[PDB]
């Protein structure tokens, strides 16, 4: 059914760190979700995963993903295409079931419970979507303090490239990436076996997502 780069938690590198996901084979085949699992994975990644059954990640990888994801939220909250984009990016990187044909294990630990833990992969993305996703998060304003959202989610990024390499960054201290995720983008047309990450991507003059004028200049008037 589904291919996954790596399934659980098998067990922390450092007695103050976290626990880091378990590299898999290609030939793993997740179970299916429990009610548990499946029910608080739509209320973190939204209505699309309601009828997934078999996903590439635990109860324990969703909660992670979850206090993660709700440290960033109030930041781009304000702009609903770059928040949608912004979580569709993480949920299917981390319980999409196709996940193991676009995450490439590079480097892995062994941890204090004598398991292998991931320490680098690759992540083969689709230039067009990770474009349109920047587009979309970077003229945030955060409210008040008159500055950028940019600063914050993106380290002041000013292309797409930099904003996914401040985001895929090891930074276990500063509440980012507990390992190091490299973003692709010359994944080769030859590689059958692998393929880039791309869904759909919502920009901040989208009807259905649209953002203020103060967040998104393509939505304002001229
Ligand atoms: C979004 O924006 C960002 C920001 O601008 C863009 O990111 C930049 O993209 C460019 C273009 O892709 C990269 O340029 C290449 O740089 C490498 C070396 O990189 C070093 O220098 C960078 C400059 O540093 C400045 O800032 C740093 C802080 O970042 C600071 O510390 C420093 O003081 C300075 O002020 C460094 O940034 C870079 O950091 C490394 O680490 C980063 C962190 O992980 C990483 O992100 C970086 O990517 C980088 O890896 C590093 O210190 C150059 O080698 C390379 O030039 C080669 O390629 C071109 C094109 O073919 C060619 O013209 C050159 O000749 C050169 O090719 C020679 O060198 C090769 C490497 O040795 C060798 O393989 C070749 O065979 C060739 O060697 C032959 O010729 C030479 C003579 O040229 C001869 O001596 C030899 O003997 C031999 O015969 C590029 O210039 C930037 O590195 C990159 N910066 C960052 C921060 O990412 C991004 O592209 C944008 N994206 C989009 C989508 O728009
Ligand atoms: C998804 O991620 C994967 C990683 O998890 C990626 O897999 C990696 O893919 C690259 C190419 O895409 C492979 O690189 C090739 O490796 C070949 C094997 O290298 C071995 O032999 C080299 C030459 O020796 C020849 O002769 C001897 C004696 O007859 C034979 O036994 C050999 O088979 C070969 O015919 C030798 O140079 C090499 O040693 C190190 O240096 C090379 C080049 O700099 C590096 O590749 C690497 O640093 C090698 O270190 C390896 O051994 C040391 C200890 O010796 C360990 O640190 C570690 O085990 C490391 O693997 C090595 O002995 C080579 O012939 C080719 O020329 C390429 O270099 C990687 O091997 C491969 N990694 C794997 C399979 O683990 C995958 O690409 C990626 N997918 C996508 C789509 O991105
Ligand atoms: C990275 O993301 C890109 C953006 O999503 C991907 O680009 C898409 O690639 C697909 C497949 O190649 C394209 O779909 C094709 O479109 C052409 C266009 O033909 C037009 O004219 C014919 C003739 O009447 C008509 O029948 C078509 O409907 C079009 O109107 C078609 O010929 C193909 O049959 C197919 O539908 C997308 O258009 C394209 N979107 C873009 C460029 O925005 C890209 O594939 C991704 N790359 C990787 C490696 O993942
Ligand atoms: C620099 C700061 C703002 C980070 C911004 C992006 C945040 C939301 C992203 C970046 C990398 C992400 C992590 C990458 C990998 C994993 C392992 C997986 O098993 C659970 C989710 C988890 C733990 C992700 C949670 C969300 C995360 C931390
Ligand atoms: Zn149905
Ligand atoms: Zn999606
Ligand atoms: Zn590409
Ligand atoms: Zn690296």
Same mark, same amino acid.
């Not at 949608?84 to 419970?113: M, P, Y």
């Not at 992969?121 to 998060?137: G, I, K, P, Q, T």
């Not at 409210?143 to 276990?172: C, H, V």
């Given at each position: 059914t589904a291919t996954c780069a790596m399934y659980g938690n098998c067990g922390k590198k450092s007695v103050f760190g976290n626990e880091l996901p378990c590299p898999v084979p290609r030939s793993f085949e997740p179970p299916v979700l429990s009610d548990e699992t499946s029910k608080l994975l739509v209320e973190v990644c939204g209505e699309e995963w309601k009828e997934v059954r078999y996903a590439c990640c635990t109860k324990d990888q969703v909660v992670a993903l979850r206090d993660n994801l709700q440290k960033?939220?109030?930041?781009?909250?304000?702009?609903?295409?770059?928040?949608?984009?912004?979580?569709?990016?993480?949920?299917?990187?981390?319980?999409?079931?196709?996940? @193991?044909?676009?995450?490439?294990?590079?480097?892995?630990?062994?941890?204090?419970?004598?398991?292998?833990?991931?320490?680098?992969?690759?992540?083969?993305?689709?230039?067009?979507?990770?474009?349109?996703?920047?587009?979309?998060?970077?003229?945030?304003?955060?409210?008040?303090?008159? @500055?950028?959202?940019?600063?914050?989610?993106? @380290?002041?990024?000013?292309?797409?490239?930099?904003?996914?390499?401040?985001?895929?960054?090891?930074?276990?201290?500063? @509440?980012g990436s507990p390992f190091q995720?490299?973003?692709?983008?010359?994944?080769?047309?030859?590689?059958?076996?692998?393929?880039?990450?791309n869904d759909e991507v919502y920009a901040c003059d989208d009807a259905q997502y649209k953002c203020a004028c103060s967040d998104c200049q393509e939505s304002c008037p001229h």
């Open positions: 960033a939220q109030p930041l781009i909250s304000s702009c609903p295409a770059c928040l949608k984009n912004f979580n569709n990016l993480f949920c299917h990187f981390t319980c999409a079931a196709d996940q @193991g044909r676009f995450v490439n294990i590079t480097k892995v630990e062994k941890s204090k419970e004598d398991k292998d833990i991931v320490a680098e992969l690759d992540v083969f993305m689709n230039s067009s979507w990770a474009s349109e996703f920047y587009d979309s998060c970077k003229n945030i304003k955060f409210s008040a303090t008159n @500055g950028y959202a940019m600063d914050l989610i993106g @380290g002041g990024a000013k292309n797409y490239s930099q904003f996914l390499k401040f985001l895929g960054d090891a930074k276990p201290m500063l @509440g995720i490299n973003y692709k983008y010359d994944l080769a047309n030859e590689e059958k076996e692998w393929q880039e990450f």
